[PDB]
Design a protein around this ligand. Structure first.
Ligand code: H1H
Lengths: 812, 140
């Protein structure tokens, strides 16, 4: 064993600083050569040579060395790792019966034991006037001798012959007899129920195989009743049945305004029932109508409803940015009810409901305590390199919570002194540490490199100016003047209206009286877009007007973010007249729930809906708002007043049209409708990504190969896309080998950056997809249970900050 | 191997070591029990040619409502309600966690010790118990 080289090549890196670079060099990557995968390493050339000179010595030592030999060297290479990470291989449930009780010498209380097979321990501590008495513990060992449990899959497509695998277990030493039967329902077409006697061996198991073929779509009910020698036990299972194809969600928003305060009148709207072209049959088009009181009324119903929803539930987790979007909508509600002094809404004690909001502002402050490095710097992924983009976004968010939750003083102080002292050039311009790309800017590379540096410093000044009132030292203001000078001396002329607006907003937190400053704001007003005469709507665009002369609808995430930056620089200059068509456009492009398109145009566009919502006073919003179908009767209505304006978003079942009726009244409320169709094909959409996905049989096991390549937009650099998310939906009964996805994100030669298998999806985030060659993901799968009539699944990539730059492919 | 009684057996070990004397161990209890069974409480002795009623309780320790067919099996030395070609079956439901007294009218004919066998099985289920017990018939 340990032939000759394994003992010498590991002892050389036994006490090295780059021993971990050698460790993940010797990992098996079959489809990438040694230099091909070494190119994506970015930790300096010292880590590359420790990688490559441990990579070449294992591909040679895998030709004529044994299988038994190399898997002993996999254990000898274990000491090149950092020490064993704290992990537990068990999941203990949330402990029930956690309460205190006043017992007058005898008390009885009843409860249901939870559906788990574990031996509980109930202990009692009695605090009274005599002292403390720890009672003798009792056990609650719920323990069945023969029991089944079924492996009900989470999501079954309609029209598949699902084999429901389950296993009976027999803890008893004597083998015994049993029979399992299944409660047939009207939906389930299964191939009075006969009992056929099978037999488990002693201290063993026995497989149980049924077969269903569901027809109806919804949450069904199947009861598995094992009747062994020790009685009959019914195990109640819920089988969710799901349609086939992609799920498209389209939106629509209307602002109700019976009095026409800030524009033209608006007293009526219809909702056209447009059935699309490539629809699946037999599945209803579902709609949900939501009617909310204030401008922030859609935002309040996110935070005050205990359903536990986020603004961007469609976008995946795993970033540090996704952990800052769990403290933002709690904050912009708390910035409203405290500065505007609106603590007279709640029927509960408002000092108590203030504590539960300050609860979540304190929980969310802990969520990026883990993404902070040792030098108080913030890294995007877990354990990744530090970023000047995230720290400026971590100081923007935390520098705002300080007025309502007391921060740690020194935490911001070493963090602001990391940006100014390490990553700011002589001419104010900042730079980036890692290869993280938050956004993709247009133009060719020498024109873009100036434009990328302008966005990167203008996103930094917002991080400084929101945190300047916490740690106001003399160096971070010494840096701010050349930071403000660089945002003067280079942003005109701007090659993109997106970078022009964030340059104008970042300067709109300091000296607002420069001859160059209002030169920007006049030039920012020059490239605005207007609807109607007088303008009922205003918005902006990513393109300059001279290179692109089009004014479209169904705007993108660059349209809603650039609109909100021009808004907040004109709410800091306090221009009411110019921004009244902007608020009407922004609060109608908002989806249902509070969420906008992406993350970066929700943090910037709820502040615009809160810095303008602190201009509207108590408007007596009390209407008898009624909605109906045209060729049908009304569902219902209710007295919608200031007492209850957070009402429940109603469901629309009948397939007629919709008309929302405000007659007379007073107020300014909003109407939002989400439609949820299921589709068959997607070729009529715009694929901005070359996609191909194959299923191939490797020989070392069925493997799945999926590649992706960014189609560049016109007048862009051909370097590659920004932060993108690969979302392979797995087919039914197929499970992904997670150890093959761990090997793509854990090395120093990582392809992706984070993975998560969530509800049968395979979601992979990534810094960049190139445009020259494809970027392929290779993980093995295995048929977990047999499924006939296998409906094809989908494969979507999309940029994380522009989720409409996408492409979709069906596969099976 | 356990015997066929649904009771609680009590085992009793008593040792003898030549230098440690006698040690009587504590009673250890084995608890034989099934869920659907037949209890056949029988008299010690019944008179020949005199008609007696023998009840047979059926316990159902199952949370389901069950459906059971109970058959008094034929015996040649009896004059029971079961004929030679046809047994005396009777079907009825039992509630969950309850009993049902099933009375069997039997007049013995020959003296000695004869079997009274009763078989019962649940409809469309697994549980099924049969009991054969001997009956002491004496003359006078
Ligand atoms: C962390 O370093 C290793 C990872 C792995 C890993 O499983 O990824 C590994 N496994 C491995 O060789 N398997 C054998 C059975 C194999 C043999 C031939 C062809 C393919 C093979 O693999 C599928 C060995 C490793 O180091 C050993 C010494 C290298 C050092 C001393 C330079």
């Amino acid at each position: 064993t340990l032939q000759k080289k394994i003992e010498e090549i590991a002892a050389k890196y036994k006490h090295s600083v780059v021993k971990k670079c050698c460790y993940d060099g010797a990992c098996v990557n079959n489809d990438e050569t040694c230099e091909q995968r070494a190119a994506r390493i970015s930790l300096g050339p010292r880590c590359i040579k420790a990688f490559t000179e441990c990579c070449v010595v294992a591909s040679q030592l895998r030709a004529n060395i044994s299988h038994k030999d190399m898997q002993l060297g996999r254990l000898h290479m274990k000491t090149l790792l950092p020490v064993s990470k704290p992990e537990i291989r068990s999941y203990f449930p949330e402990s029930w019966l956690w309460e205190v009780h006043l017992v007058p010498r005898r008390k009885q209380l009843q409860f249901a034991l939870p559906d788990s097979l574990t031996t509980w321990e109930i202990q009692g501590v009695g605090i009274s006037n005599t002292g403390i008495c720890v009672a003798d513990t009792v056990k609650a060992k719920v323990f069945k001798d023969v029991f089944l449990e079924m492996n009900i899959p989470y999501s079954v497509v309609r029209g598949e012959q699902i084999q429901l695998k389950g296993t009976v277990y027999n803890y008893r030493t004597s083998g015994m007899q049993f029979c399992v039967k299944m409660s047939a329902v009207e939906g389930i077409c299964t191939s009075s129920s006969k009992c056929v006697r099978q037999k488990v061996e002693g201290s063993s198991s026995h497989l149980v195989t049924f077969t269903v073929l569901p027809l109806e779509i919804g949450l069904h009910n199947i009861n598995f009743s094992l009747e062994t020698w020790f009685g009959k036990e019914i195990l109640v299972k819920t089988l969710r049945v799901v349609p086939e194809g992609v799920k498209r969600e389209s939106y629509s928003g209307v602002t109700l305004d019976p009095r026409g305060i800030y524009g033209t009148i608006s007293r009526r709207k219809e909702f056209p029932y447009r059935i699309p072209l490539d629809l699946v049959p037999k599945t209803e088009i579902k709609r949900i109508l939501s009617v909310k009181g204030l401008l922030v009324g859609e935002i309040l119903s996110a935070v005050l409803s205990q359903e536990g929803i986020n603004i961007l539930t469609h976008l995946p987790k795993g970033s540090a940015e996704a952990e800052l979007m769990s403290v933002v909508p709690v904050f912009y509600v708390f910035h409203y009810l405290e500065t505007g002094n609106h603590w007279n809404i709640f029927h509960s004690d408002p000092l108590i409901e203030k504590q539960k909001l300050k609860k979540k502002l304190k929980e969310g402050m802990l969520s990026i305590m883990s993404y902070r490095n040792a030098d108080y710097s913030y890294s995007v992924w877990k354990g990744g390199s530090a970023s000047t983009w995230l720290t400026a976004f971590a100081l923007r968010v935390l520098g705002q919570v300080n007025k309502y939750v007391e921060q740690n003083q020194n935490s911001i102080c070493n963090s602001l002194l990391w940006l100014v002292e390490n990553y700011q050039l002589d001419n104010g311009s900042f730079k980036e540490n890692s290869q993280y790309q938050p956004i993709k800017l247009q133009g060719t590379l020498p024109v873009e490199a100036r434009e990328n540096s302008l966005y990167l410093t203008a996103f930094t000044v917002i991080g400084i100016r929101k945190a300047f009132d916490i740690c106001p030292l003399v160096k971070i203001d010494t840096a701010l003047i050349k930071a403000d000078n660089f945002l003067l001396e280079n942003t005109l002329p701007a090659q993109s209206t997106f970078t022009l607006a964030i340059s104008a907003y970042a300067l709109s937190l300091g000296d607002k009286t420069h001859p160059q400053f209002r030169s920007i704001v006049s030039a920012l007003k020059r490239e605005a877009l207007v609807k109607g005469n007088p303008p009922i709507y205003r918005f902006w665009k990513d393109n300059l007007q001279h290179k692109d002369s089009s004014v479209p609808n169904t705007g993108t995430a660059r349209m809603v973010e650039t609109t909100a930056y021009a808004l907040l620089t004109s709410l800091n200059l306090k221009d009411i007249n110019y921004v009244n068509p902007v608020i009407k456009w922004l609060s109608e492009e908002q989806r249902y729930g509070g969420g906008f398109y992406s993350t970066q145009d929700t943090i910037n566009a709820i502040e615009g809906l809160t810095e303008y919502s602190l201009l509207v006073k108590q408007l007596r919003l009390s209407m008898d708002i009624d909605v109906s179908y045209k060729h049908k009767g009304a569902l219902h209505n209710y007295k919608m007043t200031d007492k209850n304006f957070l009402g429940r978003p109603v469901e629309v079942l009948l397939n007629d049209d919709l008309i929302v009726s405000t007659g007379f009244g007073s107020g300014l409320a909003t109407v939002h409708v989400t439609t949820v169709v299921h589709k068959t094909s997607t070729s009529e959409e715009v694929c901005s990504f070359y996609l191909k996905i194959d299923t191939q049989d490797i020989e070392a096991y069925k493997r799945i190969v999926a590649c992706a390549s960014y189609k560049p937009s016109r007048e862009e650099s051909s370097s590659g896309s920004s932060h993108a998310v690969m979302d392979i939906s797995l087919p039914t009964g197929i499970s992904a080998n997670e150890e093959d996805l761990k090997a793509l994100v854990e090395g120093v030669d990582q392809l992706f950056t984070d993975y998560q298998i969530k509800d049968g999806h395979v979601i992979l985030q990534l810094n960049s997809i190139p445009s020259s060659d494809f970027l392929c993901v290779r993980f093995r799968i295995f048929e977990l249970f047999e499924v006939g009539f296998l409906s094809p699944a989908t494969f979507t990539v999309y940029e994380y900050h522009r989720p409409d730059k996408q492409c979709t492919m069906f596969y099976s | 191997y356990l015997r066929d009684s649904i009771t609680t057996w009590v085992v009793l070990a008593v040792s003898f070591t030549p230098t440690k004397g006698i040690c009587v161990a504590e009673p250890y209890e084995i608890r034989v029990m099934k869920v659907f069974f037949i209890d056949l409480q029988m008299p010690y002795s019944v008179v020949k040619n005199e008609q007696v009623e023998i009840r047979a309780i059926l316990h159902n320790y199952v949370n389901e409502d069950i459906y059971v067919r109970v058959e008094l099996l034929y015996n040649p030395a009896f004059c029971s309600a079961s004929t030679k070609g046809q047994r005396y079956r009777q079907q009825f439901p039992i509630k969950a966690l309850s009993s049902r007294a099933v009375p069997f009218v039997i007049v013995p004919l020959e003296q000695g010790l004869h079997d009274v066998e009763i078989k019962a099985s649940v409809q469309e289920a697994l549980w099924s118990d049969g009991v054969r017990k001997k009956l002491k018939v004496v003359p006078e």
